[PDB]
Design a protein around this ligand. Structure first.
Ligand code: ADN
Lengths: 660, 37, 82, 37
């Protein structure tokens, strides 16, 4: 998004280069796993045919101009071997040029000389040596060229495309740390906020560090030698990035933090852009991390809802999932033209072309135009369309989804481990023997659930736990109980309570959970109303957001995100230490609730769930989080109180804004 | 010293080949005519 | 005391191929597959087992319309559900 | 032909070493005296 200004006085020269790179994209090296794009249900090659030519030219220029560093030797033998391999690379390049020129070596030997095909430093080194060595290496180069240009070409039937991949593969290993960028800084801070820890790692020494980013490994750092790298994180694990003047901060999902300083703001932006670009290629193509480096096209797509250059099969498949009702449509940029958008509408699947020119939008085959794509869509909404014998009216658009798999994303070995697991119908939990628990006193009643204090033996020993027992009169919903218990088994986060297992005792079923002594956040907010401060509230909100993001990544659904389900592990009111909270268990699902009980959860329950309970999905959480944010800022005041049930229903029905 | 050793470059052989993606095949119809109620 | 079948000891030799044949640990995990109540159809009575009743039945949408046997725990003995 | 090529055997280098088991350490006591009821 950098703005370039020309005022008749400025003069500058730039380069158009391929920046993002994945090592071992070619499959020649079998020692490591290859990389490939996803395909609709062999693997699609990563690069287009046209791009490979420009990449080849870029690599050749990098090698010849000595921009990339050549590896240093470890002895005399490999010190000569590297020069031999460079001469072989020059042979390969000149052979490629001769073949593409469509003429043999004897046809145009006028411009042949190996000097123009080696790094300048190596040329300078040879020039200082004896003439006899020069003559001998000339003879060796000529003999190698004569052999390759006549024997190998018929022996292997190598074509023009065949040599480029070999050139790039050889350059990948002949070069020092190829395809990576490394930054240097004098300060580096790593922080973690484990419970009661707040460990401020690192020291205030004057030693220097280096940070390196690469496609297949992520972010790594170490102290500069006067040592092996240590891993920090991979791209899907990051959440957001913030720039403070010239200090860059990186925040992970487990609340770990990294903070470092660079030379200036320009360096900070350059550093941030690389990570932001890699995130889109590896994690999600419909999102940007930092507001300061957002490309305009992604912002436009997010505002309007257009997909990227996605394949037609994916667009067709998406419409099938929504029932394929008449009037639904999908927008996506054309796979070949920089100014056309393919409105795919649905059985029939008709296509339409919208032409975009100098910021003016107009449907193909008409002369009227509009200044905004949204305006063009709105005008087109109310007319009736005619094509062949069928007429239809558009009703609603389809939108992308978080981490939606498509051919835009790139699969890698490291990212393979982050894929979700399939648990479509498996129910699994841990059994606790009835002899290891001791039941205590009554603590209160939940939603069709009773709670007692208790102790667990021989898991240390004599540990205190909370026991939740299903009501005897409501055993029909035992399937929901088992489903919730199975769901809670898969999560592992520092801001969610821990589930020990389930104990079977006669007809009863018991859930055993961790004990947090601070109590619900609601009562604490009620009592300490006057002492609360703004940073306290922001710290509370951040952790809840992080936990909900973690739940979203694994495609699980929590239906009771409210203040009553927030437990205080540390008040933090007294001193600089911040509060610490944990999120409780989902509890009884809304799917088994009556019509009246759905009303009393206004405005916490989403409207589409009130319309039909089967519509429950991950999107319901973003409404409850918004309601909870309002609940926090007013000291736990009851939202929308004093309203009767009919008024609450009218609130949802009339599409009015509930709270401001 | 080096005159006593002659060896072909290790990178001048080829095996198992490679391939990029060719291209996407262009295609698009249009039968758009509009009417107003 | 007497030896036991496949008793592990220093006499045995570990190899990569034999590593896959080792047993899995399921000390306390209980896992099974859920079947929705709309996919089964209950048939006629077939007889009684040990505190168990047996009926013929059919399973839908797993081909389709496949015949199965349904075993139901007795209502009066739910304490042994574990 | 072969006089133009001199190369050390690839198997004459060593790295990372190896080790067998040494032995078992003998030990055994005896304090056996028997009685009859
Ligand atoms: N998940 C839980 N963890 C810790 N304490 C809990 C939990 N649920 C309820 N309580 C306790 O129940 C009481 C209020 O219902 C408080 O003592 C509170 O600490």
């Amino acid at each position: 998004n950098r703005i370039i200004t020309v005022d008749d006085k400025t003069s500058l020269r730039l380069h158009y280069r391929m920046r993002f790179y994945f090592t071992n994209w070619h499959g020649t090296n079998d020692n490591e796993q290859s990389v490939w794009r996803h395909s609709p249900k062999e693997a699609t090659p990563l690069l287009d045919a046209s791009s490979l030519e420009y990449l080849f030219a870029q690599g050749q220029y990098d090698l010849i101009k000595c921009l990339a560093p050549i590896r240093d030797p470890k002895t005399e033998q490999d010190g000569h071997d590297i020069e031999n391999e460079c001469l072989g690379m020059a042979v390969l390049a000149i052979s490629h040029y001769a073949m593409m020129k469509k003429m043999q070596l004897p046809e145009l030997p006028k411009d042949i000389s190996y000097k123009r095909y080696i790094p300048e430093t190596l040329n300078k080194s040879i020039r200082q040596r004896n003439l006899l060595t020069r003559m001998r290496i000339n003879n060796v180069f000529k003999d190698f060229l004569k052999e390759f240009n006549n024997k190998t070409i018929c022996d292997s039937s190598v074509s023009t495309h065949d040599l480029k991949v070999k050139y790039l593969a050889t350059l990948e290993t002949l070069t020092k740390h190829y395809g990576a960028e490394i930054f240097e800084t004098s300060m580096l801070l790593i922080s973690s906020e484990n419970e009661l820890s707040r460990c401020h790692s690192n020291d205030s020494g004057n030693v220097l560090y280096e940070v390196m980013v690469t496609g297949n490994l992520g972010i790594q750092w170490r102290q500069k030698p006067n040592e092996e790298w240590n891993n920090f994180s991979y791209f899907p694990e990051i959440t957001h990035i913030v720039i403070k003047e010239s200090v860059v901060s990186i925040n992970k999902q487990d609340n770990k933090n990294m903070e470092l300083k660079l030379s200036s703001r320009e360096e900070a932006l350059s550093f941030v852009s690389l990570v932001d670009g890699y995130f889109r290629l590896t994690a999600d193509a419909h999102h940007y991390l930092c507001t300061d480096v957002a490309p305009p096209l992604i912002v436009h797509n997010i505002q309007n809802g257009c997909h990227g250059p996605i394949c037609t099969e994916y667009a067709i498949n998406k419409l099938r999932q929504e029932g394929s009702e008449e009037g639904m449509y999908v927008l996506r940029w054309s796979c070949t033209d920089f100014d056309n958008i393919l409105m795919t509408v649905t059985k029939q699947f008709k296509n339409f072309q919208i032409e975009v020119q100098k910021g003016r939008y107009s449907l193909h085959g008409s002369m009227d135009h509009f200044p905004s794509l949204r305006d063009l869509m709105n005008h087109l909404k109310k007319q009736i369309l005619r094509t062949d014998n069928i007429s239809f009216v558009l009703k609603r658009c389809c939108q992308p989804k978080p981490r939606e798999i498509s051919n835009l994303l790139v699969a890698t070995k490291k990212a393979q481990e982050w894929q979700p697991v399939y648990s479509m119908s498996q129910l699994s939990f841990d059994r606790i023997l009835k002899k290891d628990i001791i039941q205590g006193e009554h603590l209160g009643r939940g939603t069709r659930t009773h709670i007692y204090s208790g102790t667990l033996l021989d898991y240390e020993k004599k540990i205190k736990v909370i026991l939740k027992v299903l009501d005897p009169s409501h055993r029909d919903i035992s399937l929901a109980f088992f489903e919730a218990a199975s769901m809670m088994r898969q999560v592992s986060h520092k801001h969610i309570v821990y589930l020990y297992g389930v104990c079977f005792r006669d007809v009863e079923n018991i859930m055993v959970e961790e004990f947090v002594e601070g109590g619900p956040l609601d009562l604490f907010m009620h009592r300490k109303s006057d002492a609360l401060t703004t940073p306290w509230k922001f710290k509370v909100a951040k952790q809840l957001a992080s936990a909900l993001s973690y739940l979203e990544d694994k495609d699980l659904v929590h239906g009771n995100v409210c203040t009553k389900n927030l437990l205080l592990a540390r008040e933090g009111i007294d001193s600089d230490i911040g509060p610490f909270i944990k999120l409780s268990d989902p509890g009884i699902p809304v799917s088994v609730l009556t019509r009246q009980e759905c009303i009393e959860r206004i405005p916490w329950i989403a409207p589409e769930c009130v319309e039909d309970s089967k519509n429950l999905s991950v999107a319901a959480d973003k409404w409850s989080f918004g309601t909870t944010l309002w609940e926090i800022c007013y000291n736990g005041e009851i939202p929308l109180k004093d309203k009767t049930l009919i008024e609450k229903e009218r609130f949802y029905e009339s599409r009015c804004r509930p709270v401001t | 010293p080096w005159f006593q050793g002659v060896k072909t470059p290790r990178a001048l052989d080829f095996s198992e080949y490679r391939y990029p993606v060719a291209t996407f095949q262009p295609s698009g119809p249009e039968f758009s005519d509009d009417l107003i109620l």
